[PDB]
């Protein structure tokens, strides 16, 4: 997270940390949507690691220092969107299934809890303030991820300002949403991918976007791009299979 503040996992209990066997390596963030399912970004799985190489940790404030109430899980399998475009990042969404001995995997605690999925017809006013989280880099030129979870607060940009012309001619589809700091500017950064962009909707933090991509981290007037989740509700459902 570029800008922002250091946070406690209890303020974002749906944040998952995904590791890949190297010896472990921090891969991306994730979002707990159900007891055994977590959402993430399709671009995180380009290297095509077998499920048994992935570990999902829940309830951890520090990236590599074990929390007292954390829950580690093996990955049963994962589903990357069939139409994910490796060049434009369109359809950047994946589903990961947790391994367990029953139909229940993660258990609720003060440090582990699900975000609410958005209503299919969710529409927020321009500039709504939302927040995000992740263990990613603090700056684009940084060679290290964060030692501790961080949070940032951004505002949803108008669709009119979420275009190729605005993103230096980088391709922007209807499956994407822009959000940024309207003013150390806050922004997502490398390593935060797959994490959540959530907004308060009727007293509950609701998932609005999956941290996808951006140009650098925190450049004035250049918003971050996120996978537009409302467009994937039917896909989430059809794909949540045992």
């Amino acid at each position: 997270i570029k800008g922002g503040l250091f946070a406690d996992i209890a303020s974002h209990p749906w944040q998952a940390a995904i590791f890949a066997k190297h010896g472990e390596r921090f891969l991306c963030g994730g979002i707990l949507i159900s007891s055994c399912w977590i959402l993430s970004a399709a671009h995180c799985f380009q290297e095509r690691f077998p499920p048994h190489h992935l570990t999902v940790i829940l309830g951890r404030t520090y990236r590599v220092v074990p929390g007292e109430e954390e829950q580690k899980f093996e990955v049963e399998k994962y589903i990357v969107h069939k139409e994910f475009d490796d060049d434009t990042y369109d359809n950047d969404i994946a589903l990961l299934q947790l391994k367990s001995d029953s139909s229940r995997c993660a258990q609720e605690s003060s440090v582990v809890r699900t975000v609410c999925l958005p209503p299919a017809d969710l529409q927020l006013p321009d500039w709504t303030e939302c927040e995000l989280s992740g263990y990613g880099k603090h700056e684009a030129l940084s060679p290290f991820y964060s030692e501790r979870l961080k949070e940032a607060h951004v505002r949803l940009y108008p669709s009119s300002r979420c275009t190729s012309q605005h993103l230096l001619n980088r391709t922007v589809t209807d499956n994407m949403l822009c959000a940024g700091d309207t003013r150390n500017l806050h922004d997502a950064c490398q390593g935060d991918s797959g994490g959540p962009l959530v907004c308060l909707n009727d007293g509950r933090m609701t998932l609005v976007g999956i941290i996808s991509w951006g140009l650098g981290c925190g450049q004035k007037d250049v918003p971050g791009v996120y996978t537009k989740v409302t467009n994937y509700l039917d896909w989430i459902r059809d794909n949540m299979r045992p």
Partner: peptide, 7 residues
């Protein structure tokens, strides 16, 4: 339930 956090 969902979306609740340590406030």
């Amino acid at each position: 339930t969902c979306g609740l956090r340590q406030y």
